[PDB]
Amino acid sequence: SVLYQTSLMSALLSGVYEGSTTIADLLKHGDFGLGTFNELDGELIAFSSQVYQLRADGSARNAQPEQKTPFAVMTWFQPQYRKTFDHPVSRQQLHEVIDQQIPSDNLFCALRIDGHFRHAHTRTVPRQTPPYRAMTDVLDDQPVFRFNQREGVLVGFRTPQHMQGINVAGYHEHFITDDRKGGGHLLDYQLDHGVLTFGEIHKLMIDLPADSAFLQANL
Amino acid sequence: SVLYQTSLMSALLSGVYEGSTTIADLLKHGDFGLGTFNELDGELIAFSSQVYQLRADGSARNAQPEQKTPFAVMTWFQPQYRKTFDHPVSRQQLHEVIDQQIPSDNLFCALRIDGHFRHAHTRTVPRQTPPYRAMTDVLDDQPVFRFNQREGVLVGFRTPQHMQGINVAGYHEHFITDDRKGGGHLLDYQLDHGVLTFGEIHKLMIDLPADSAFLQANL
Ligand SMILES: [Cl-]
Numbered sequence: 131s132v133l134y135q136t137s138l139m140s141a142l143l144s145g146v147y148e149g150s151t152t153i154a155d156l157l158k159h160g161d162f163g164l165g166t167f168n169e170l171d172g173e174l175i176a177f178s179s180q181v182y183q184l185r186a187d188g189s190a191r192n193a194q195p196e197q198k199t200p201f202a203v204m205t206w207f208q209p210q211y212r213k214t215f216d217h218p219v220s221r222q223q224l225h226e227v228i229d230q231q232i233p234s235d236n237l238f239c240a241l242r243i244d245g246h247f248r249h250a251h252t253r254t255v256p257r258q259t260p261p262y263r264a265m266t267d268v269l270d271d272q273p274v275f276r277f278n279q280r281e282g283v284l285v286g287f288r289t290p291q292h293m294q295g296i297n298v299a300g301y302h303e304h305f306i307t308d309d310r311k312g313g314g315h316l317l318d319y320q321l322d323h324g325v326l327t328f329g330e331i332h333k334l335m336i337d338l339p340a341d342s343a344f345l346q347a348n349l
Numbered sequence: 350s351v352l353y354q355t356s357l358m359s360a361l362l363s364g365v366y367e368g369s370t371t372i373a374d375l376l377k378h379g380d381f382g383l384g385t386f387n388e389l390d391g392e393l394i395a396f397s398s399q400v401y402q403l404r405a406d407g408s409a410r411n412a413q414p415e416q417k418t419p420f421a422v423m424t425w426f427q428p429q430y431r432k433t434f435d436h437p438v439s440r441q442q443l444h445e446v447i448d449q450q451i452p453s454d455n456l457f458c459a460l461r462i463d464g465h466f467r468h469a470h471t472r473t474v475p476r477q478t479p480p481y482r483a484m485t486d487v488l489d490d491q492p493v494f495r496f497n498q499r500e501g502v503l504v505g506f507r508t509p510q511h512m513q514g515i516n517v518a519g520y521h522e523h524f525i526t527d528d529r530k531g532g533g534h535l536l537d538y539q540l541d542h543g544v545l546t547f548g549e550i551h552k553l554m555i556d557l558p559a560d561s562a563f564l565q566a567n568l
């Protein structure tokens with residue numbers, strides 16, 4: 131298993147909000163992952179090669195193969211572990227299960243949950259036009275959506291602290307509903323019951339783009 | 350071209366001085382590069398699939414395929430640029446030639462020089478036994494070797510500042526003499542005349558080990 135990363139979080143945060151990488155290009159290096167759309171028009175969630183666009187209004191829709199991303203992380207998901215929960219468990223409790231099984235912070239984890247969420251709180255970036263506001267100011271203004279008692283899918287990664295420059299350090303998780311019409315970037319959640327699958331990943335490929343914005347960015 | 354990195358500089362600097370990766374394993378992902386030997390017994394230089402061990406006494410010898418490394422960076426060298434110097438040029442002048450041609454700090458460069466060095470100043474780490482002294486104290490005690498008016502080969506990489514956690518930020522260059530009996534990790538040099546070949550690299554593969562020392566290291 132290889133975590134295949136398109137560009138750098140530092141480049142995204144510097145104001146490089148467009149890339150030439152398509153959703154079809156992402157699915158060449160995985161069936162599973164997360165990322166951002168061109169102009170920061172929400173974020174993607176991918177699992178079993180199905181890709182959805184999650185937008186700031188709490189909506190999900192099928193991603194089109196031609197859509198472009200300035201940043202993404204994909205893998206061929208090959209989980210080594212399965213745990214079924216018949217009783218409610220919080221996000222932080224689920225992370226403790228994963229951290230106990232993969233206690234080295236120096237490895238990546240990929241995690242998926244299929245089940246019934248008591249709640250799933252989401253906040254997703256809206257489409258930006260330059261000159262760009264500070265990301266923290268954009269997030270202050272974005273409403274949180276609260277999915278209550280919903281069946282759905284969670285996709286996430288755990289990133290080592292030794293990667294903080296390059297990627298989201300810690301857990302990054304996205305959510306989509308069973309009907310695939312709702313979801314977002316997760317702030318917190320509680321699983322009422324469902325199945326966790328996850329695995330460790332030892333290999334990271336970083337693919338730096340050629341666009342002039344990336345090349346001329348100050349990192 | 351892919352820069353293939355075995356482990357992390359942060360893990361090496363934390364005191365993880367042994368890996369299970371062999372020189373033969375390194376040559377599976379390149380013909381060119383740099384790295385460190387188990388127990389920090391000097392450093393390797395590799396070019397056209399020839400690999401040499403450079404030790405603290407200023408000696409070079411052929412590396413054996415079974416020797417192990419805790420850290421290395423290798424590539425299939427595919428230079429896009431060639432410049433011949435008929436007149437003396439310093440290391441810092443040569444770097445200016447490369448930086449002008451590949452002005453984005455956000456890309457990697459691989460560089461090779463074949464030619465006659467006015468001087469090549471080297472300092473190479475000696476074999477360490479735990480408990481380990483601070484790397485800065487070890488370097489303070491290591492003599493500098495000065496190669497004067499020698500034909501030889503330089504191998505090096507330029508690492509983006511956006512990678513400082515993971516790798517040597519900036520230029521990392523090693524030197525070996527024509528007779529392959531002398532060389533080391535370069536501090537400074539001047540080329541009297543010779544040929545520079547170099548290329549940009551957009552892709553980095555980081556391969557994290559499984560040994561308990563790496564997994565239990567604090568990074
Ligand atoms: Cl709620």
Ligand SMILES: [Cl-]
Nearest residue numbers: 468495496497
């Ligand atoms: Cl000298």
Ligand SMILES: [Zn+2]
Nearest residue numbers: 173302304315
């Ligand atoms: Zn997200």
Ligand SMILES: [Zn+2]
Nearest residue numbers: 392521523534
């Ligand atoms: Zn060196």
